[PDB]
Design a binder for this molecule. Structure first.
Ligand SMILES: CCCCCCCCCCCCCCCCCC(=O)OC[C@H](COP(=O)(O)OCCN)OC(=O)CCCCCCCCCCCCCCCCC
Ligand SMILES: CCCCCCCCCCCCCCCCCC(=O)OC[C@H](COP(=O)(O)OCCN)OC(=O)CCCCCCCCCCCCCCCCC
Ligand SMILES: CCCCCCCCCCCCCCCCCC(=O)OC[C@H](COP(=O)(O)OCCN)OC(=O)CCCCCCCCCCCCCCCCC
Ligand SMILES: CCCCCCCCCCCCCCCCCC(=O)OC[C@H](COP(=O)(O)OCCN)OC(=O)CCCCCCCCCCCCCCCCC
Lengths: 354, 136, 239, 362, 239
């Protein structure tokens, strides 16, 4: 059986591609509208457009399962509403064979999606985030909400922005006394990570002599400070947990568990990233079950509407079950397992119903 | 309400060049929420570098608005010149409308100069803070 | 082979539709199934096909109980099916329309598959259109291609549904010619249709179902003579 | 006078069902964010129910017009597919008569939405704010971990604590840095706070007076000589609630009675916004009738997603115009009504398409 | 009264489906409209009804150019209509089903409307089911109620569309009786469907359209004896 498999696979694949394109376009438009509020004469409209276009791959990867569900629904509905699946069944083919024929392109798409996620989404998402942070953070002592505080010894650091090439922007650090009396307050315009140590550029430190003696100001163009933070950790502590690679999530989870800090959110992100193929398979199975049962001979509009509604309900359930695991101390794996299992069970029931 | 309050504060403020702006000690600092008004009970202002020679102040109470537009010295008012002349030239009146933003010496009432060698009374006070010269 | 449905019976949500209906179709003979729309003619036809499970009764084909088998199980058993509405693979050429089904057959090999496809194309006079897409075919050519596709599975009984519905009088001749051509090969056809005149014209015997129970059966002459049918389905004025 | 009741009942029932579904969806969507905030440490889970109960009317005030839009679409699509409306039209009932028939449920929904948006959303928001101004913030400053930087209120302010007692109080070296996004002059730019121990004092009337055992207060800029060093023993600054008014501007809580006459641009813009919902309901009713004519080929559900998108765009344009008008750029004389005019014109053109074409064909 | 359609012509995307087809119905007579499915028969019927705008021609009724009037304009001008599928107000009592239309008639008062409704109910032998909802009625009662409603609109010409579609031979007699009743009332009727036997039996005339042009006309005897229609539409085997 070669021609029927190709027919079904091509139909579903093209439908999925079109649905994914439309969904990604709508998501990009909504993101642009929502983020248009941040223009401040230092973050131009071109910058926002560049950020959105660079963030597109991450959102496409995130929304791939919904596109798969809706596209499979539409394609199978197009096939069935023309009395073609009935002919195939009456010719000897079986529902298991039809499900396999639909799933094979789904397997290819799942492999492509996992690869794209874990090998591209981090890179482009990081590039976009770094660009936006650099655009918004070339300001003053502490003038960005994309910043990053820190503390070592008795000196409290700040960082306006962090760049992928091991360069910081606007490093302001306060040095105190054992008596908690301030002694200095510096502001370095940039910083670069020489392998041995951090190097500052164009600092403007001001020294406050404790006593009533004269207060002075000094300017060292290339002052050098030895700090504990490292570029690799900095590039990870800022990015959202859901934007890291699978290997990056694994490494950060182990690094956190090493020092005793909790990592439930990172466990949730890792489980949601690694178990996506199972969720996609369950969603496609539920869609196939819908086609053979209730939505047997309904119009295309009803198929699209029901697919969108089911996708919205599933997304809301899985999003509410995410933080709920952290709040209620649920194992993070359940928040991912539950909705997919429910959808697969419902699909299997409706399929057994014939 | 009061947004921030302090007890037995001993604050320092430095000039743009680096010289001391003043050294004020107050019993309590109160900043109401309705306006940026700070009450400094019993201030001890000392313009250490405002005029090189400190201007000792022993005002019983001082009222400060959002800015130093009118830091009025209410109740006991004292101005110990402490300049090259050994005469304190302490002025008491009831209030002294110092102008930190304007930086001028003006009196809200008749000037009562309690000098060392001789005490004199003058009407009004119009004298530059930097100059430090007697002027009605 | 002799398809046999014995004591079929189904009940819908509220009321019974078919009760104690028995049928029998033998290879090489055409059997029509006619009755009032409210009757259980359609439900009996679909239960024989397998679309709707039958509460009671056994549907067996030559001493092989296929009552519990699914639609594809029966299709492998030997039964066929031809839906009334258009059921042609729109984006597949006619040659592909036939070869896609021809692939599923287990016995055939590549050379055998190609030879069978050529024979089927020549048999039904669709050679000239062996490249047109399914969506571009007319009613007559579409029906010929559909019948060729149905035959490509090598069925033992083909259950046509409303063959004459929505066809002008000129095309009913071609439809009847196709049905007789199928009957010549040995297949047995079970026609259900609204057009009683043509169905009785072609079918060799007819089964009439009134309220879930078949009320008459026999040749066309006998069916036209029964008074119960004349009072329930045909009417006195008929013919 | 029978078709009037028939159509009114159909439209009302469908609108009620769609409104219930939309309300459930929206409430779950916002509960997602609230639960995320609670899991992050802020907020108190016990107060979520009250927050949602007091915020429901604000959701209804915007859901109801969309509910009516979709209900009209679904009901008239059903009547078109089942041939009832073809028989109605083939007997004398024109389309202006149909609009008159459908303008009764629209009027009832407009009355309901006006009541909501003018006398229940304000009171609901006021109660929400009053019951949110509670121990929630007192919990947040108790959420401090001995090694975490809680950047309260975006990037303006931060908070730190080397060591915090489990029972609260007797904190270790505390560091609090606040920055003002305004001009800030020079000294007001950055102001840090360091106290050796620090403590929290419950106000007799206020929320909490964080009492610092001993420390300093520093003001100025990192690259400037002037620095106001304040040395104290006891220092007290209240802790504002992170969500006391962040998600609810005071413009919403003011009763509609006070909005009249006030020369404050924000108040007048809010008053114009409050009156826009009934007009929106009538406009959606006007432009939902002609769009409800569907043949069986394209079904009944095809034009629901585009309708939702159109309604969302309508609301977004209204809100953007309201903001740019309350910020002073758009003159108040033109106001917010030109958006209503634009959508009324588009709906009118959509309604008169068939008569215009028929007149075009001589 | 006479509903005249003159030189009707309609061109779809790029094809001229109908070209210069002229028909005329006179009050008090039944006229049929038959032809092959592809040809311009349904298109002409709709251009007469009003569901498709005519590129050329004038559909005038009693010297009113009603080509441009919408469907409700025609309905107020005298013409009527009756959709092929069931078109009864589902959740509305039959009495309310007729009164919903009776209330629109301007030239009536409450007592007159009640008397007219009673006369309509008793004239179509549907009085006993006067309280049943629209969903309960079966085929015959549903058709009778739909006809009673259409009459309650008080039309001059009633354009039936496929009245003999999927009806048992016994029930066709009732529809023929209803059509004869309407004709006796003095209402010109236009009938179109694929039942070339019942339509020719009941109809007093028949217009056959093939390739978008009128190819024949006249009573059943002339139509059947005609040769062009036989070769293109009826087929030699017919009759
Ligand atoms: C930095 C990168 C930024 C990328 C930004 C991307 C923005 C996307 C916005 C798209 C908005 C418009 C969507 C247009 C597509 C839908 C239109 C439609 O109905 O198309 C139907 C068409 C039918 O296919 P046809 O060629 O007719 O073949 C039929 C086979 N019998 O269907 C088709 O097959 C044609 C449509 C194909 C659409 C392909 C695009 C969808 C997936 C895009 C993923 C992009 C990111 C993925 C990762 C990239 C990593 C580098
Ligand atoms: C919390 C609730 C969330 C609900 C989300 C939205 C779901 C909408 C479902 C739309 C698809 C069914 C539409 C039914 C319309 C009315 C019935 C109809 O027309 O068909 C009758 C059909 C009976 O035929 P058959 O399937 O043979 O039994 O009827 C049936 O068989 C009806 C059987 C319906 C089964 C629905 C299963 C729902 C699964 C939802 C998964 C949610 C995942 C998120 C949580 C994890
Ligand atoms: C619990 C979780 C939240 C609620 C989930 C939904 C539960 C109920 C789902 C019912 C789905 C019914 C359906 O798809 O069929 C259409 C329905 C029945 O008609 P049917 O029998 O199919 O006849 C043809 O025909 C109807 O009468 C449908 C009326 C029911 C409401 C339809 C959906 C309206 C809301 C759509 C929201 C889409 C997403 C919007 C997101 C933005 C919101 C601001
Ligand atoms: C089948 C579906 C049919 C329905 C289609 C949808 C039609 C809806 C039409 C209405 C669209 C609503 C758009 C809402 C925009 C909201 C903008 C906003 O909130 O930002 C306001 C922003 C403030 O800027 P400001 O503060 O003045 O700048 C100085 C900075 N201190 O202001 C600005 O900076 C303004 C700059 C705007 C630049 C263009 C932005 C793109 C807008 C695209 C909207 C969608 C268009 C889709 C059309 C499809 C038609 C078929």
């Amino acid at each position: 059986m070669v021609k029927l498999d190709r027919y079904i696979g091509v139909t579903v694949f093209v439908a999925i591609l079109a649905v994914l394109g439309v969904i990604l376009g709508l998501a990009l438009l909504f993101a642009f509208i929502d983020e248009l509020n941040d223009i401040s004469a230092s973050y131009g409209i071109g910058d926002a457009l560049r950020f959105i276009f660079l963030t597109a791959p991450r959102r496409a990867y995130d929304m791939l399962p919904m596109a798969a569900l809706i596209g499979c629904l539409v394609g199978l509905g197009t096939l069935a509403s023309n009395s073609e699946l009935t002919i195939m069944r009456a010719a000897g083919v079986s529902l298991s064979r039809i499900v396999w024929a639909v799933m094979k392109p789904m397997l290819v798409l799942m492999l492509a999606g996992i690869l794209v996620g874990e090998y591209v989404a981090p890179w482009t998402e990081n590039i976009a985030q770094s660009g936006r942070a650099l655009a918004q953070g070339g300001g003053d002592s502490q003038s960005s909400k994309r910043g990053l505080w820190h503390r070592q010894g008795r000196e409290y650091i700040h960082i306006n922005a962090v760049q992928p090439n091991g360069v910081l922007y606007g490093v302001t650090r306060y040095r105190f006394d054992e008596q908690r009396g301030l002694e200095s307050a510096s502001f370095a315009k940039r910083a670069r990570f020489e392998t041995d140590h951090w190097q500052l550029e164009e600092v403007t430190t001001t020294l406050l002599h404790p006593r009533e003696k004269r207060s002075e100001v000094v300017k060292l163009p290339t002052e050098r400070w030895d700090a504990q933070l490292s570029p690799q950790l900095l590039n990870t502590v800022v990015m959202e947990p859901e934007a890291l690679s699978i290997s990056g999530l694994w490494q950060y989870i182990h690094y956190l568990a090493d020092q005793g800090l909790n990592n439930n959110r990172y466990w949730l992100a890792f489980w949601t990233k690694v178990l996506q193929p199972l969720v996609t398979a369950a969603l496609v199975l539920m869609a196939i079950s819908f086609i053979f049962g209730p939505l047997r001979s309904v119009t295309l509009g009803q198929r699209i509407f029901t697919g969108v509604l089911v996708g919205f309900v599933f997304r809301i359930a899985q999003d509410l079950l995410g933080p709920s695991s952290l709040v209620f101390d649920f194992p993070p794996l359940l928040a991912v397992v539950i909705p997919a299992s429910i959808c697969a069970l419902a699909g299997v029931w409706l399929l057994r119903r014939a | 309400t009061i947004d921030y309050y302090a007890e037995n504060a001993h604050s320092l403020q430095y000039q743009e060049d680096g010289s001391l702006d003043y050294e004020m000690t107050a019993v309590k600092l109160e900043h109401q929420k309705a306006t940026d008004i700070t009450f400094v009970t019993t201030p001890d202002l000392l313009l250490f570098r405002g005029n090189v020679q400190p201007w000792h102040i022993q005002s019983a109470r001082a009222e400060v608005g959002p800015k130093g537009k009118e830091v009025e010295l209410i109740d006991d008012v004292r101005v110990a010149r402490t300049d090259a002349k050994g005469q304190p030239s302490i002025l008491t009146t009831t209030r002294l409308t110092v102008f930190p933003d304007k930086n001028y010496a003006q009196t809200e009432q008749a000037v009562k100069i309690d000098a060392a060698n001789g005490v004199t009374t003058a009407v009004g006070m119009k004298a530059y803070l930097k100059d430090s010269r007697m002027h009605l | 082979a002799t398809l046999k449905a014995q004591h079929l019976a189904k009940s819908y949500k509220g009321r019974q539709v078919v009760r104690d209906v028995s049928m029998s179709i033998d290879s090489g003979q055409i059997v029509g199934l006619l009755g009032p729309n409210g009757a259980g003619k359609t439900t009996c036809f679909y239960m024989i096909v397998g679309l709707v499970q039958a509460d009671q009764g056994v549907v067996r084909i030559d001493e092989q109980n296929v009552t519990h088998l699914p639609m594809h199980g029966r299709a492998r058993a030997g039964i066929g099916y031809l839906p009334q509405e258009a059921s042609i693979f729109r984006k597949l050429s006619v040659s592909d329309n036939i070869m896609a089904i021809l692939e599923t057959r287990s016995d055939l090999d590549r050379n055998g598959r190609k030879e069978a496809l050529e024979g089927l194309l020549q048999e039904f006079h669709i050679h000239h259109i062996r490249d047109n897409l399914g969506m571009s075919l007319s009613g007559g050519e579409r029906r010929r291609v559909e019948i060729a596709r149905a035959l490509a599975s090598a069925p033992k009984f083909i259950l046509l549904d409303e063959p004459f519905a929505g066809v002008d009088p000129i095309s009913v001749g071609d439809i009847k010619q196709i049905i007789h051509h199928l009957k010549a090969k040995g297949i047995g056809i079970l026609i259900t249709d609204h057009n009683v005149r043509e169905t009785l014209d072609i079918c060799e015997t007819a089964y009439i179902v009134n309220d879930g129970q078949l009320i008459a059966e026999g040749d066309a002459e006998s069916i036209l003579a029964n008074d119960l049918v004349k009072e329930v389905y045909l009417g006195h004025e008929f013919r | 006078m029978i078709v009037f009741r028939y159509l009114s009942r159909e439209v009302l029932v469908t609108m009620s069902a769609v409104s219930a579904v939309l309300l459930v969806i929206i409430m779950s969507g916002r509960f997602i964010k609230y639960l995320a905030q609670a899991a992050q440490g802020l907020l108190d889970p016990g107060s979520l129910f009250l927050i949602m109960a007091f915020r429901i009317p604000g959701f209804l005030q915007l859901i109801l017009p969309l509910g009516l839009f979709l209900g009209i679409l679904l009901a008239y699509g059903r009547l078109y597919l089942e041939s009832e409306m073809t028989v109605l039209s083939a007997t004398g009932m024109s389309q202006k008569r149909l609009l008159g028939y459908t303008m009764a449920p629209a009027l009832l929904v407009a009355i309901l939405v006006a009541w909501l948006s003018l006398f229940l959303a304000p009171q609901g928001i006021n109660q929400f704010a009053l019951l949110l101004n509670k121990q929630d913030t007192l919990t947040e400053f108790d959420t401090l971990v001995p090694g975490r930087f809680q950047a309260m209120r975006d990037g303006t302010r931060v908070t730190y604590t080397e060591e915090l007692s489990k029972d609260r109080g007797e904190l270790a070296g505390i560091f609090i840095s606040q920055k003002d996004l305004n001009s800030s002059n020079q000294e007001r730019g950055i102001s840090i706070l360091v106290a050796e121990k620090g403590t929290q004092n419950i106000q007799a009337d206020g929320s909490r007076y964080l009492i610092l055992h001993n420390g300093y207060r520093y003001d100025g800029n990192p690259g400037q000589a002037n620095y106001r060093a304040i040395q104290y023993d006891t220092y007290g600054v209240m802790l504002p609630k992170p969500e006391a008014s962040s998600e609810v501007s005071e413009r919403d809580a003011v009763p509609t009675a006070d909005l009249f006459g006030s020369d404050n641009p924000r108040y007048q813009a809010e008053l114009q916004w409050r009156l826009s919902t009934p007009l929106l309901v009538f406009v959606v009713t006007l432009l939902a009738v002609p769009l409800s004519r569907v043949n069986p080929r394209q079904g009944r559900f095809l034009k629901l997603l585009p309708a939702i998108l159109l309604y969302m765009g309508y609301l977004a344009l209204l809100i953007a115009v309201r903001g740019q008008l309350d910020k002073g750029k758009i003159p108040m004389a033109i106001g917010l009504w030109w958006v209503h005019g634009l959508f009324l014109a588009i709906g009118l053109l959509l309604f008169y398409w068939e008569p215009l074409r028929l007149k075009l064909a001589s």
